[PDB]
Amino acid sequence: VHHQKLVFFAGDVGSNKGAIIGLMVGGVVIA
Amino acid sequence: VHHQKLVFFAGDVGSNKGAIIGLMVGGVVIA
Amino acid sequence: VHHQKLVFFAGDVGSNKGAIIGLMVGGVVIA
Amino acid sequence: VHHQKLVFFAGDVGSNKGAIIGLMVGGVVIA
Amino acid sequence: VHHQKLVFFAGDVGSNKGAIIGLMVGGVVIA
Amino acid sequence: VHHQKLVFFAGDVGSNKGAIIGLMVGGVVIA
């Protein structure tokens, strides 16, 4: 079992107002 | 079992107001 | 079981007003 | 020339991620 | 020339991540 | 020329992460 670089941004990101998540299994996220 | 670079952005991203997720298995995400 | 670099930003990030999360299993996040 | 209540929200608004504008005549808005 | 209450919110607003603007004539707004 | 209450919030506002502007004529706003 090997995970790596699940979400990757090679460039500039201007702004995040929402959610960014690698691995998600439970809980709650309201962005 | 090998995961890698599931979601990849080679350019500039201007803005995220929603969700970006690599692997998703459970839980809840409201963006 | 090996996790690494789940969410990766190779460039400049201007601003975060939301959530950024590597691994998520439980709890609650309101951004 | 009388203007009033051009945009009206009688209930609860959960979130705005775009533009809300009463009167618009010039300029530029991205949201 | 009478303006009044151009944008009106009678309920609770949860969050603004964009623009809210009453009268707009010039300039530039990103949000 | 009479302006009044251009943007009005009768309820509780949870959070502002963007712009809120009454009258706008020039300049630049990022938020």
Residue numbers in the entry:
A (entry chain A), B (entry chain A), C (entry chain A), D (entry chain B), E (entry chain B), F (entry chain B): 12 to 42
What did the original publication write about this model?
The Arctic mutation, encoding E693G in the amyloid precursor protein (APP) gene [E22G in amyloid-β (Aβ)], causes dominantly inherited Alzheimer’s disease. In summary, we report the structures of Aβ filaments from a case of AD with the Arctic mutation and from mouse knock-in line AppNL−G−F. These findings have implications for our understanding of AD pathophysiology. Comparison of local conformations in this region revealed the presence of additional hydrogen bonds between adjacent Aβ molecules in mutant protofilaments; these hydrogen bonds cannot form in wild-type protofilaments, providing a plausible explanation for the increased fibrillogenesis of E22G Aβ. Mutation E22G may have an additional fibrillation-promoting effect, which is the relief of electrostatic repulsion as a result of removal of the negatively charged carboxylic group of E22; in the wild-type structure, E22 is trapped in close proximity to the carboxylic group of D23.
Besides tetrameric Aβ filaments, a minority of dimeric type II Aβ42 filaments was also present. Solved to 2.8 Å resolution, their structures suggest that they are made of mutant protein, but the presence of some wild-type Aβ42 cannot be excluded. Only a minority of filaments is made of mutant Aβ42. Apart from a lack of side chain density at G22, their structure is identical to type II Aβ42 filaments made of wild-type protein. In these dimeric filaments, the terminal carboxyl group of A42 contributes to the protofilament interface.
